[PDB]
Every structure is written in structure tokens, then in C-alpha cells.
Design a protein around this ligand. Structure first.
Ligand SMILES: Nc1ncnc2c1ncn2[C@@H]1O[C@H](COP(=O)(O)OP(=O)(O)O)[C@@H](O)[C@H]1O
Ligand SMILES: [Mg+2]
Length: 465
């Protein structure tokens, strides 16, 4: 059919532009490290901000007391509460409540955002049961995870640099995010002090090390993507204070903003960025993250539907709608194994609004999902590889003796729930490492680990009382 060769040409340029041979991945990992060095010396125009987090001591286990945590949150926010027992007892009690963020609150007024989340924290502390005790006269203390880039000014204070992953609230850039929350808690008649402000990457790394001593980094793969790691404070040229007692510092790399001419981008990525909420920003994230994967698939399917009549001789109206194909929908289609792809086809009926689909159209769709998820997962593995190279963990002992154990905590709905994405991520990372080096790296799932991690860092920075 002519329509068949016209479809093969589209799929062929997708394969060509999206191609990520291991050799290219090593050059991208090298460029990541190059960019990490630029951000640590405060280079102008550095894509990676490499933010000092003021976390110089990760949790040890001896944390004790009662502490709350507020976790925000690209798609949801959760309020957490733990009773910490100490090196031997640990988390005696724990309670949490997760709430989905209404879509308007991502793009409205900052007072509406913080009023909404502070009101849910209010009704949450009001149900504080008897398993959690607060000594008399004392003030309840909070750990605040703020999943957006913040120029840190103390362990508990920081300026919003910019919004990401679907958020766009005027009037917060430049403002202290902890003061903005503190005011909202006050308007709710709520006695709490924020004693720790962390990015969700820094929090997951805190929560990860609390249960595994070898956690060296945290990678987030959810609605957005980002990563944090532990750096040597004497390896940060832009550091100007004293130097931490522990010689360590957690860095929020903000690696979604990574950009490199080595990144295999296409016209679909240019169009996606052009019509986005933050054009020109977060180039790397827009190839990896959950908010954008399904949208890349939709734009490829649209090209096919138009240039090859893939879904009929009239392009389906719904297919032209932006973000109509969410990434969990992409994930559902991708995992269909039935001989006729009946579940991929059932999903396509909802999302496209068509009555039916060719078996051949279903296999093309499955192939597109495959190419988009594969490129995102391989590039994310290249980023993790770059971190390991920064910590000198890409290689094993030369003296031939003593393999280290390096743990990387992973968090986010993409990694947790997109099976093909996760296994492609881990396979490529193991490929990038040697067979010798890979047996020393652990990818641990620490989902929503910034909740307890923010509570732990609020603990070690209490007032007290
Ligand atoms: N089944 C799935 N398949 C693919 N991606 C998913 C799936 N479930 C969730 N996700 C992605 O993970 C995100 C939710 O992850 P989570 O870390 O809880 O929130 P956020 O990253 O928004 O703070 C969603 O926005 C979605 O992009
Ligand atoms: Mg979640």
C-alpha cells in the first residue's frame, strides 16, 4: 500500500533520531559530569544548578521525637507524622494522608496553593492520635519537601528559582517558600515551625540512608525527573562559608535542565518544548519524565495518523488534543501481550475516540511506545552513570581487592509502575557499568522517601521543642 511505505518512513526517522547506542550514552554521561563541574563552580549559564542543600549530615538512626512532614509534590501532596524512637526503636508510629493536587492550583495564586495544603495539614494534626506525644509547651516541628528548584539560604529557608512539571504560579519566583507556607499555616491557626526545607531528591536520599547506610544518591522519576547525591564540600568551588564538620554536602543537581547537543532530540521534541509551559527549560526532563512520555507518543501517532491514515482516512479529533494520551495510558498499552493486542486496542478506542483499529495499527502503536520509553530509560541510565562517575563509582578496585557497595535510591511513579521502563533503565545502567562494576551498584526503590526523610532532617535540626 502506498500508505504502508509512508508509515515506514516516519517510523524510520523516529528510530534514527531517538537512537541511543551505548557509545552515545557514554558521551552523554561524560557531558553530565562536565556540567556538574560547571554548576559547582557557579559558572554562568550552567544548565545544572547544583544547589547547595545545607544538608551536611544525613540521618543516622538516632533520631527521636515526634515530627511532621509536608511533601509537595508534582501531582499530589502528602502530610506525614512519625514518632521516632532512636537507634534501637526507630519509627514507633507512622501515619500519612495523600491528596491529589487540583489542576487549577498548579497555575493559580500562590496563596491558593499554600492555603489548600495548609488546610489539609490543619485537619491532619487535629486528628493526632495517642500514639504520638508532644511534650508540654513544645512547638510541633515540620520538614518541608518542596519538589521544585530552590536557591537554598539555610537548612530551612529558600527562594523559588522557577516552577517545573506543570506548575506555573506568578509571584512566587524570588520568594521564600518556607515563609509562604508559614504564613498560610498561620492563617489556619496552626502552630508549627518548619525546621528543614529540602527538595524531594534530597529528602529521598535522607530517607534512603535512614534504612541503608550505602545510599549515595537519589534519582526521582515521576511527573518530572531530578537527582541528588552526596558531594565532598571541598570539591564545590562555589562554597564560601566555613566547611561542614562532616566534609559532606548533598547537592540538588536539578538535572532535568540538562541540555547537550549529544541528546538525541527530534522535531517532536521541539514542538513539545515550543508548546510547553516552560519553553526552553528542562530539555532533558522532557525526554524522560512521566509528564512528557505519553505526549511524545501522541505527537508521533499524530504524524502517522496524518501522513499514513493510520487510524482511518480522517485523523481522530481527540488525537490532536495535547496531553490526551497520558503516560500511564502509554504504559498500559506497552505491556499488552495478547496475540491481537486487544487491551492496547481498547485503550486506543478511549483515547482516540475511534471505533476500531487495524492489527497493524496496534503493532505500530506498540512500537512507538517502545521507542519513546526506550530512549527515556536509556538517557536516564546515562544520567545515573554520570553520577556514579562523579563519585568515582563507575570502576571497581584496581588493587584488585574490595568491591564497594553503592546504593541509589529511586522514587517516582514512572520508575515504580512502568515495568518496561524500569527494566530497560537497569539493563542499560548495568551495560554502562562493567559486569564487574555493576555487581557493586544497587538500585533501591524508596518511593515517597522524601516524606520521612524531611521529617528526619527536621528532627536533627529541632529547636528543640
Ligand atoms: N502506571 C504508570 N505508568 C507510567 N507512569 C506513571 C504510572 N503511574 C504514575 N506514573 C507517573 O508518576 C507520576 C506520579 O508519581 P509521584 O512521584 O507519586 O508524583 P510526582 O512525581 O508528581 O510528585 C505521575 O504524574 C505519572 O507521570
Ligand atoms: Mg505517589
Amino acid at each position: 500500500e502506498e500508505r504502508r511505505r509512508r508509515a515506514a518512513a516516519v517510523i524510520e526517522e523516529v528510530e534514527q533520531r531517538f537512537s541511543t547506542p551505548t557509545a552515545l550514552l557514554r558521551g552523554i554521561a561524560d557531558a553530565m559530569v562536565e556540567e556538574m563541574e560547571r554548576g559547582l563552580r557557579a559558572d554562568p549559564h550552567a544548565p545544572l544548578k547544583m544547589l547547595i542543600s545545607y544538608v551536611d549530615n544525613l540521618p543516622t538512626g538516632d533520631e527521636h521525637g515526634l515530627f511532621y512532614a509536608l511533601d509537595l509534590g508534582g501531582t499530589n501532596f502528602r502530610v506525614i507524622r512519625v514518632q521516632l524512637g532512636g537507634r534501637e526503636k526507630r519509627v514507633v508510629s507512622q501515619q500519612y494522608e495523600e491528596v491529589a493536587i487540583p489542576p487549577h492550583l498548579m497555575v493559580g495564586t500562590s496563596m491558593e496553593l499554600f492555603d489548600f495544603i495548609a488546610a489539609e495539614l490543619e485537619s491532619f494534626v487535629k486528628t493526632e492520635g495517642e500514639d504520638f506525644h508532644l511534650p508540654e509547651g513544645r512547638q510541633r516541628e515540620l520538614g518541608f519537601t518542596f519538589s521544585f528548584p530552590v536557591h537554598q539560604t539555610s537548612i530551612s529557608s529558600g527562594t523559588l528559582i522557577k516552577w517545573t512539571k506543570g506548575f506555573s504560579i506568578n509571584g512566587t519566583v524570588g520568594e521564600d517558600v518556607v515563609a509562604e507556607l508559614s504564613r498560610a499555616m498561620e492563617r489556619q491557626g496552626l502552630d508549627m515551625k518548619v525546621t528543614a526545607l529540602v527538595n524531594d531528591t534530597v529528602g529521598t536520599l535522607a530517607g534512603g540512608r535512614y534504612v541503608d547506610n550505602d545510599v549515595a544518591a537519589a534519582v526521582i522519576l515521576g511527573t518530572g525527573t531530578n537527582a541528588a547525591y552526596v558531594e565532598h564540600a571541598n570539591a564545590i568551588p562555589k562554597w564560601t562559608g566555613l566547611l561542614p564538620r562532616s566534609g559532606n554536602m548533598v547537592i540538588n543537581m536539578e538535572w532535568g535542565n540538562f541540555k547537550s547537543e549529544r541528546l538525541p532530540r527530534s522535531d517532536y521534541d521541539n514542538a513539545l518544548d515550543f508548546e510547553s509551559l516552560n519553553p526552553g527549560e528542562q530539555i532533558y526532563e522532557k525526554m524522560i519524565s512521566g509528564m512528557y512520555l505519553g505526549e511524545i507518543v501522541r505527537r508521533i501517532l499524530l504524524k502517522l495518523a496524518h501522513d499514513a491514515s493510520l487510524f482511518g482516512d480522517v485523523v481522530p479529533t481527540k488525537l490532536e488534543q495535547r496531553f490526551i494520551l497520558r503516560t500511564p495510558d502509554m504504559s498500559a498499552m506497552h505491556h499488552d501481550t495478547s496475540h491481537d493486542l486487544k487491551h492496547l486496542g481498547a485503550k486506543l478506542k478511549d483515547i482516540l475516540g475511534v471505533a476500531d483499529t487495524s492489527l497493524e495499527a496496534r503493532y505500530i502503536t506498540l512500537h512507538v511506545c517502545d521507542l519513546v520509553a526506550e530512549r527515556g530509560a536509556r538517557l536516564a541510565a546515562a544520567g545515573i552513570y554520570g553520577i556514579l562517575k562523579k563519585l568515582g563509582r563507575d570502576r571497581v578496585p584496581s588493587d584488585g581487592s574490595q568491591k564497594q557497595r553503592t546504593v541509589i535510591a529511586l522514587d517516582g511513579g514512572l520508575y515504580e509502575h512502568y515495568k518496561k521502563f524500569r527494566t530497560c533503565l537497569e539493563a542499560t545502567l548495568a551495560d554502562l557499568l562493567g559486569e564487574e562494576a555493576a555487581s557493586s551498584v544497587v538500585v533501591k526503590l524508596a518511593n515517597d522517601g522524601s516524606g520521612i526523610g524531611a521529617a528526619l532532617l527536621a528532627a536533627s535540626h529541632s529547636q528543640y521543642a
